[PDB]
């Protein structure tokens, strides 16, 4: 029960582009060792209920991961597909948020509903998350159909433990409902991000393809 390379693959996703070198040591057992990244815009201008979106990343994230197939034995492709993943990586991710929130528009933070009146507002956020070794966990369905290719899906996320936060508006004097401004709130939300369990995590999710050569 060796590991024997097989291929690689190319993958997009929530946090960026790149790819991964794959291993398989039986039908249940694999591994990949991968990067993702890249200086992208991953929305821009993005309308939505009065509100634009905005977010830019710059991210260098470096995985390696085993892949377990509890049923990577079964000629059910439905079932051989789904795996579970563990592993660690280097992150030094960098996210920046934009909410423009329009005339007349709405936005909730921290439970706090405010209007954007006459001109709007906007909303602000940069976080960075370091960490040399994140924990990861995930899951996955990547079906066997070919000697040569395939393709997979993945969801999962890292404990990279809280991003260094910083949120900020144009606009911070506006009352939200519940009597806060939003300088206030936003404050509120910048020590939660910065240190509740909750935060300690960081998403993602990416599909791309395998190729086997």
Do not use: C
Not at 40 to 55: A, F, Q, R, V
């Amino acid at each position: 029960n060796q590991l024997i390379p097989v291929g690689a693959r190319a993958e997009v996703g929530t946090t960026g582009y790149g790819g991964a070198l794959l291993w398989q040591a039986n039908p249940y057992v694999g591994l990949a060792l991968g990067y993702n990244g890249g200086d992208i815009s991953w929305s821009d201008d993005l309308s939505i209920n009065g509100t634009k979106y905005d977010m830019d990343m710059d991210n260098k994230l470096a995985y390696l991961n085993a892949e377990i197939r509890p049923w990577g034995a079964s000629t059910n492709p439905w079932a051989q597909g789904l795996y579970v993943a563990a592993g660690a990586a280097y992150v030094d991710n960098q996210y920046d948020l934009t909410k423009n929130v329009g005339t007349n528009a709405s936005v909730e933070i921290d439970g706090n509903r405010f209007n954007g009146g006459a001109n709007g507002v906007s909303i602000a956020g940069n976080l960075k998350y370091d960490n040399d070794i994140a924990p990861y966990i995930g899951f996955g369905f990547a079906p066997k159909f070919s000697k040569n290719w395939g393709v997979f899906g993945e969801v999962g996320a890292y404990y990279s433990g809280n991003p260094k936060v910083s949120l900020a508006s144009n606009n911070d004097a506006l009352i939200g409902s519940d009597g806060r401004t939003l300088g206030k709130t936003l404050d509120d939300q910048e020590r939660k991000i910065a240190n509740d369990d909750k935060y300690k995590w960081l998403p993602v999710g990416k599909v791309g393809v395998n190729f086997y050569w």
